[PDB]
Amino acid sequence: PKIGLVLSGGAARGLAHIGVLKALDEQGIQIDAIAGTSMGAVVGGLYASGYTPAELERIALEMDWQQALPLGVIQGQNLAMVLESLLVHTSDNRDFDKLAIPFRAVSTDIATGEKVVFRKGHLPQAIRASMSIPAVFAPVEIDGRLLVDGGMVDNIPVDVARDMGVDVVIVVDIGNPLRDRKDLSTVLDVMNQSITLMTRKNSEAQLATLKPGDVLIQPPLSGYGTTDFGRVPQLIDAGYRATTVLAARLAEL
Amino acid sequence: RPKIGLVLSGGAARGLAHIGVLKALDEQGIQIDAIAGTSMGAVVGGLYASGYTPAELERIALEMDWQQDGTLGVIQGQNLAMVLESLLVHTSDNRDFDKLAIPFRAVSTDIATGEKVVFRKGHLPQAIRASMSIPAVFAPVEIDGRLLVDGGMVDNIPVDVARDMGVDVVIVVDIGNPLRDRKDLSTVLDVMNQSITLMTRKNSEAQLATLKPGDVLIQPPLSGYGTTDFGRVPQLIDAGYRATTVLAARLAELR
């Protein structure tokens, strides 16, 4: 049976995906397709390009997050540079099905609200577009479309993975926790909260489509902030432990 | 004769078109038995429910001083509060909104939970103010321990609320919520607002798809009308009036 891996969108919490990967390889579970949004697209796409979970863990641990003309523009440039540098070996690739593992990334066309699925082109640019959280990174233009992260239209792209032809999906949902009324002090917070609501709705809808055979992994991440990169060890381990406890069920694949 | 609910969709400047609708509705002798509204729909609808005539609403709108990738309003909230409080001095606080001249409901979003919050009692100016709390324009307001923004993102076209007021038929005014073009998205604020516009359109269409035969959708022709373009109040009001005049035959079938 063909196994697809769906990595949900997010920021810091998405580092938990590394853990999941580390556990999957440890259990000898072969992935035939990967679909991701934002940090799910980053981790999943780097993995799909040929990186090992150990390498991704190392990269995450040695990364200077705090460090990485409008601020969103600058940070967008930095994002692009880091991704391009990490994915230099895919320079001559154009077909995402021809990566080490077939890959899809998800963005939102900010002009129309349409879901945009990347299956071809330049992998670092697709990942960057999918990672382009509003108010953190400036929108990216690809093929005449202005694109932001896919979170607001398809944060958990189960059906994208299924469209890649797999029979079963392993779905990792890192969650998108709402803020308390004490953490909604500024306009930015209100806007971001609205986006969070949107994201949660489409995420719930996609999760409702899971069927017998599919495996849902929800790493224990209560208390972890969206921009909390000071706890990378715990983030990775949370994803790892949540997948390890399911080894009995995963083994049936 | 059936009980008629009026549903006034949310927005800002475009919401003034509601006045036109009202002007036509009264002119055709259509009795409204209940009103449910969001943001400007709640402002126009709420003022109307408190006894203001469409002519008076038009006069108010016409004489109002509305003037009060790049990176990105408590005072605005205070002034909105002031104008609403002034217009509604004939109603007290601690009042049942079903006891207004026309039963009224206003819709807001609990920004902490994302839950819909429907006002059916209390201080009318405060409820309308909450419903009008558009993020990035008006600071959120606190009511009964809840932090509230406008209801657009959860229930921009509150049809089921109107039905919950026990009406048989609804007249539903969708003044629309247009997306900005790619070329018009310049600030981060623009992007955020665009996303809000998207979720607003989603819930709006979900509610609109529930309209039954007998109900009547009125969709005013507001194609090129900016969401905060208060420089064309006459045109705005006329659009609502024209739209309701065109559907006169469908609406006549209500009474």
Domain ranges of chain B: 1-255
Name beta bridge partners: B173.
Answer: B8, B218
Q: Number of Cβ pairs closer than 8 Å across A and B?
A: 92
State the DSSP code for B7. E
| DSSP string covering A7-21 | E---SGGGGHHHHHH
After which residues is the backbone of chain A broken at C–N > 2.5 Å?
68
Q: Cα–Cα distance between B134 and B112 in angstroms, integer?
A: 15
For testing contact with chain A, the best of B142, B198, B202, B203 (most A CBs within 10 A): B198
Evaluate whether A145 touches A123 at the Cβ level (below 8 Å): no
Pairwise CA distance, residues B84 & A179, whole Å: 30
Experimental method: X-ray
- Which of A112, A114, A161, A118 lies closest to A142, judged by CA? A118
What are the chain A neighbours of B187 within 8 Å (beta carbons)? Answer: none
Cβ atoms of A105 and A36 within 8 Å: the answer is yes
- Coil/strand/helix, residue B115: coil
Across the interface, do B192 and A70 touch by the CB < 8 Å criterion? Answer: no
Check: CB of residue B59 under 8 Å from CB of residue B113: no
Active-site annotation of A, residues: 38, 149
Closest CA to A200 of A222, A175, A226, A223: A175
| Torsion angle in degrees (nearest 10) through CA of B47, B49, B55, B58 | 30
CA distance B42 to A144: 39
Residue A170 β-bridge partners: A5, A215
Is B198 part of the contact surface with chain A (CB cutoff 8 Å)?
Answer: yes
| From A146, A178, A198, residue closest to B185, measured CB to CB | A146
CA distance A122 to chain B (A): 22
B60 C-beta neighbours (distance < 10 Å), count: 15
Out of B149, B179, B201, the one facing A190 most closely (by C-beta) is: B149
Classify burial at A244, counting beta carbons within 10 Å of its beta carbon; exposed 0-12, middle 13-18, buried 19 or more.
Answer: middle
Cα(A224)–Cα(A135) distance, integer angstroms = 20
Whether residues B182 and A111 touch (CB distance < 8 A) is answered with yes
Taking alpha carbons only, the member of A75, A183, A190 closest to residue A136 is A75
Which residues in chain B touch residue A135, judged by CB atoms under 8 angstroms apart? 72, 188, 191-192
Q: Do A180 and B135 touch (CB under 8 A)?
A: no
Resolution given for this structure, in angstroms: 2.1
Q: Which two tokens stand for residue A21?
A: 């990967």
Contacts of A110 in chain B (CB under 8 A): 182, 185, 191, 194-195
Amino acid at B64: M
Reduce the DSSP state of residue B236 to 3 states and report it.
helix
What is the distance between the alpha carbons of residues B188 and B16, in angstroms, rounded to a whole number?
27
* CB B186 within 8 Å of CB A147: no
Task: Determine the Cα–Cα distance for residues A42 and A118; give it in Å rounded to an integer.
Answer: 13
- CB-based contact B135 A194, cutoff 8 Å: yes
Q: What distance in Å separates the CA atoms of residue A220 and residue A175, rounded to the nearest whole number?
A: 9
Radius of gyration of chain B (CA): 17
Report d(CA A164, CA B232) in Å as an integer.
Answer: 51
For residue A141, the one-letter residue type is E
- SS3 per-residue string spanning A219-245: CCCCCCCCCCHHHHHHHHHHHHHHHHC
A231 vs A65: CA distance, rounded Å? 11
DSSP A98: G
Q: How many residues does chain B have?
A: 255
B186 at A interface, C-beta within 8 A: no
Chain A environment of B198 (Cβ under 8 Å): 113, 152, 198
- A218 by DSSP, 3-state: which? coil
Distance CA A171, CA A174 (A): 10
Q: How far apart are CA A46 and CA A56, in angstroms?
A: 8
